Design a protein around this ligand. Structure first.
Ligand SMILES: [K+]
Ligand SMILES: [K+]
Ligand SMILES: [Mg+2]
Ligand SMILES: [Mg+2]
Ligand SMILES: [Mg+2]
Ligand SMILES: [Mg+2]
Ligand SMILES: [Mg+2]
Ligand SMILES: [Mg+2]
Ligand SMILES: [Mg+2]
Ligand SMILES: [Mg+2]
Ligand SMILES: [Mg+2]
Ligand SMILES: [Mg+2]
Ligand SMILES: [Mg+2]
Ligand code: NA
Lengths: 150, 35, 104, 141, 77, 56
RNA sequence: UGACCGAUGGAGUGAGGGCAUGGGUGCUAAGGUCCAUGUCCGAGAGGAGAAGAAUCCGGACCACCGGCUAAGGUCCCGAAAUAAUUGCUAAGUUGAAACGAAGUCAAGAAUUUUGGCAUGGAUAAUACACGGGCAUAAGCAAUUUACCGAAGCCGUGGGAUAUA
């Protein structure tokens, strides 16, 4: 039987407050912007944050190609991967990711600041990265947000 | 061209691409690398 | 109207006629009137007062419904592997149930 | 070899070099010299190599003094010999030195190439060194 | 190889048993020594193995004299 | 006169003479306060366990 | 403090180990070996260090959806400052030596010394590391204030074992 009578309430699928926000990447640093984006996606800015529920915001990033990498990171940061075959290690750069597309670079950075579980694998799908300032997300009425305020 | 841990100096000491060189165009047998 | 007040060393949010369980109060009877006057916050349907040295004049009067409510049994187990040491006890926490009559 | 002709005991316990030299740290008998900045055992082979290096230079003027003498015997076990069963075979003598001790010194020589002869001697030693000059020496001889 | 060493004898537990300022009784052993490292004085005897002992009760006194010779005596009454 | 000594650090890994000094002062728990006359012997104990106590 | 000493009933142990200090031995080698003085693991859970028997903090009677701290921390994974102020580093250094330029700042003396931070020396075999993302500070050095942080301390409820 329950002798507590004063509990903390967890949010659930029917009680979360999910919103669409738009942030800009005009001159921000890649890691410093992506940490704030990870906090937005996880829902650390909501007073009803619940670590076992998708309670964050759907984030649209515009002007993704204007992001800034300081130092020699654009070609001096060596990402390594493996194909699974002998002699199968490969190298690539943030420049290679940017050439492929800005969404791939942003997804790679944000996955790594997100939790490593099923919930984080679900959360990463709430992020939308676009190269220019033109995107098509009507019927949801996204709200502009100043990322420098956060 | 000779590469050695300690290079020393009309030869002139220059730094190129993070490496140390001692060059002498008058006498090319005195070039050195990796100071 | 709700107040934030502590009862037996734990802060609770309480309204009128709530039927709380609190830590055991010794030497009480059914229907006995208990008093708790250490309110930290009062929220009167819009007007909120916060007390550093508590809220002056605030007060919660309750009546005891059950003088001894035991909680669910918990098994307490100690074991150190490969050493042979092992013991298993039982524990039941002790509560009293009160009903809040007036919230001043 | 540079070693005593006789010793009372053939064996010696490996001591412990502790601090800085409190004697033999000032320049007597000479003008220029080198001090050691580290604590180490110095072998007679190293000493003879350093003296030969310092005396091949400088021609034959001036005077050269070595101020440490190796008198501590050391042993070595051998190949395939296990631990225990007493001390090993003799392997010569060493001199234990501490920081601040003057090894080599020279006199009657111009400063500008005494500085070079002593560096040549110091390159054949297992310790880092420091060049020192007398505190009354003047530039004009 | 082999070692030609490895021998020792049992330690003889020598030294001062009663220090200056302590109270001693007659017959108490004061000093165990090899040779007269300390010498007898007033009311202190010396045995076959140069052991110093108290002839009377009292307080042990250690005193030094010329040649830095040390004497042990008992101060009674 | 009376001074107040409060234990602020643990006795774990301290030598037995220091542990026995803490016992002689009367400190057996962390954040415990004892009150003693400031005699030279008490001051000597405090000096011995200075790295574990605070004068409050 | 309280368990020091006597006399009596019952034992177990008599394969130890790591770290620090003083030494012997060894090669001033070994996660080596032999002693001495402490301490911890043994027989000891909890916190930080990514993950570690004995390194740093700390000795667990039970419960609690209460509070304060220790070591160590406060951009995200991950709790708490994208806090404030002053400098240094441009190497992603960062989060091993003789021996060489001296890249750079600073303090001097009559070319020269002096320290701070970097740089070359610097090196093998399944794929690689600041734990990872990543960072020009979120690096290094100094100072100040808040805050996080343990089964340590306090609070509340409940037991047990002794000395008075
Ligand atoms: K590590
Ligand atoms: K955090
Ligand atoms: Mg003997
Ligand atoms: Mg045996
Ligand atoms: Mg044994
Ligand atoms: Mg061992
Ligand atoms: Mg060792
Ligand atoms: Mg055992
Ligand atoms: Mg223990
Ligand atoms: Mg631990
Ligand atoms: Mg706090
Ligand atoms: Mg806690
Ligand atoms: Mg406790
Ligand atoms: Na022996």
């Amino acid at each position: 039987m329950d002798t507590l009578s004063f509990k903390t309430i967890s949010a659930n699928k029917a009680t979360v407050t999910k919103e669409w926000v738009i942030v800009d990447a005009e001159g921000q640093t890649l890691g410093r912007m992506c940490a704030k984006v990870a906090k937005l996606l996880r829902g650390k800015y909501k007073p009803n944050f619940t670590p076992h529920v998708d309670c964050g915001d759907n984030v649209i990033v515009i002007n993704a190609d204007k992001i800034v990498l300081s130092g020699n990171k654009w070609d001096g940061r060596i990402y390594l991967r493996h194909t699974g075959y002998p002699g199968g290690q490969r190298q690539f750069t943030p420049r290679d990711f940017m050439n492929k597309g800005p969404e791939y670079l942003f997804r790679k950075v944000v996955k790594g600041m997100l939790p490593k579980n099923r919930l984080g694998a679900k959360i990463i799908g709430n992020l939308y990265v676009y190269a220019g300032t033109e995107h098509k997300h009507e019927a949801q009425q996204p709200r502009q947000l100043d990322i420098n305020s956060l | 061209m000779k590469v050695r841990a300690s290079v020393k100096k009309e030869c002139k000491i220059v730094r190129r691409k993070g490496r140390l060189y001692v060059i002498n165009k008058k006498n090319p047998k005195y070039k050195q690398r990796q100071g | 109207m709700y107040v934030i007040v502590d009862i037996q060393g734990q802060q609770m949010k309480v309204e009128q006629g709530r039927r709380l369980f609190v830590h055991h109060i010794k030497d009480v009877e059914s229907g006995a009137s208990v008093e708790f006057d250490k309110v930290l916050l009062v929220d009167n349907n819009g007007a909120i007062t916060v007390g550093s040295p508590l809220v002056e004049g605030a007060k919660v009067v309750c009546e005891v419904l059950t003088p001894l409510v035991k909680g669910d049994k918990v098994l307490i187990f100690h074991k150190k592997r490969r050493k042979g040491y092992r013991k298993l006890n039982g524990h039941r926490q002790q509560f009293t149930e009160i009903l809040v009559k007036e919230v001043v | 070899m540079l070693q005593p002709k006789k010793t009372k005991f053939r064996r010696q316990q490996k001591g412990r070099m502790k601090g800085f030299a409190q004697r033999g740290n000032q320049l007597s008998f000479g003008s220029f010299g080198i001090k050691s900045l580290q604590s180490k055992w110095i072998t007679g082979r190293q000493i003879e190599a350093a003296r030969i290096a310092v005396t091949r230079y400088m021609q034959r003027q001036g005077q050269v003094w070595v101020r440490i003498f190796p008198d501590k015997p050391i042993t070595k076990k051998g190949e395939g010999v296990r631990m225990g069963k007493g001390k090993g075979a003799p392997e010569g003598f060493v001199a234990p030195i501490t920081p601040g001790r003057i090894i080599f010194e020279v006199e009657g020589v111009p400063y500008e190439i005494a500085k070079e002869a002593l560096r040549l001697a110091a390159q054949k030693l297992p310790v880092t060194t420091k060049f020192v000059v007398r505190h009354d020496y003047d530039i004009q001889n | 190889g082999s070692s030609k060493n490895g021998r020792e004898s049992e330690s003889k537990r020598l030294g001062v048993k009663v220090y200056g300022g302590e109270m001693a009784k007659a017959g108490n052993i004061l000093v165990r020594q090899r040779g007269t490292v300390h010498h007898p004085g007033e009311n202190v005897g010396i045995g076959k193995d140069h052991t110093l002992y108290a002839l009377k009760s009292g307080v042990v006194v250690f005193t030094r004299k010329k040649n830095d010779r040390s004497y042990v005596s008992i101060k009674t009454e | 006169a009376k001074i107040k000594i409060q234990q602020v650090r643990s006795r774990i890994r301290c030598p037995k003479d220091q542990k026995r000094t803490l016992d002689a002062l009367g400190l057996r728990k962390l954040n415990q306060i004892v009150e003693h006359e400031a005699t030279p012997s008490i001051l000597g104990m405090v000096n011995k366990v200075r790295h574990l106590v605070l004068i409050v």
